């Protein structure tokens, strides 16, 4: 009804292809699919290991293991980015 503002750098992200354009990856638009796939596997193993090392949680835990356990959900987004880049020829 009036112009709706969006921040500078807003681009068109609607896709009807097999995979979205690499622009949907933001700052990761230039990373290759091999690098996302290897980072995804790495993050999944390190995140699962760190998660496993602190499943009995105690009042004093190792702080690095806590931070490293956040790599398991991050790996899901990494392998989705690997599928997007492999189907974009990157």
């Amino acid at each position: 009804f009036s112009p709706v503002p969006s921040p500078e750098g807003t681009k068109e992200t609607y896709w009807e292809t097999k995979a979205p354009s690499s622009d949907v990856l933001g700052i990761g638009a230039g990373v290759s699919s091999g690098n996302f796939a290897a980072a995804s596997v790495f993050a999944a193993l390190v995140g699962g290991y760190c998660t496993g090392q602190v499943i009995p949680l105690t009042v004093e835990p190792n702080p690095l293991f806590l931070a490293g356990s956040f790599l398991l959900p991050y790996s899901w987004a990494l392998h989705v980015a690997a599928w997007i880049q492999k189907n974009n020829g990157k």
Binding site: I27, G28, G30, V31, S32, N35
Partner: protein
């Protein structure tokens, strides 16, 4: 292809002109972040690291008047804990925070394409008035700064094993 790493491809973001270029970016991190931000970040890490390695050596060489009576034994990172009880660190923190506030404004101006990475125009003595000798001092700053990051990490970690401190650990 890349110079430093012959099997790997030349980094896209990196350029020959960018001081301290060896074509070294195997993981392609320069593609992820803005290259000027990484350049400013490397230059800043270089200068802090240079000061810290020189300080580590100097702390083994001598001690300013009265410091022996606040801290007796602690040499590298132990001194920081005693000084935070006093105002010594808080003071450095406050003034460096103030200097970094204008560093933040400088970063914003750089990221819009106007200022150059690490260029704060701080050249009181006449050391860069040639623009060929200037290029040599820029590259020397980056190489000495990179060496200093590795050194500062090396010295602090050696203190973590032994507690000796850098030069005394060299002696024994």
């Amino acid at each position: 292809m890349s110079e430093s790493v012959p099997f790997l491809k030349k980094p896209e973001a990196l350029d020959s002109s960018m001081a301290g270029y060896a074509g070294f970016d195997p993981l392609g991190l320069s593609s992820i972040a803005d290259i000027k931000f990484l350049q400013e970040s490397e230059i800043k890490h270089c200068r802090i690291a240079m000061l810290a390695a020189a300080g580590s050596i100097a702390q083994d060489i001598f001690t300013f008047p009265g410091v022996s009576k606040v801290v007796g034994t602690a040499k590298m990172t132990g001194v920081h804990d005693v000084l935070v009880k006093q105002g010594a660190m808080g003071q450095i923190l406050l003034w460096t925070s103030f200097l970094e506030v204008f560093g933040t404004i400088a970063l914003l101006e750089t990221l819009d394409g106007k200022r150059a990475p690490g260029d704060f125009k701080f050249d009181p003595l006449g050391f860069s008035k040639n623009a060929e000798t200037a290029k040599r001092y820029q590259l020397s700053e980056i190489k000495n700064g990179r060496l200093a990051m590795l050194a500062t990490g090396g010295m602090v970690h050696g203190y973590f094993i032994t507690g000796k401190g850098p030069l005394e650990l060299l002696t024994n």
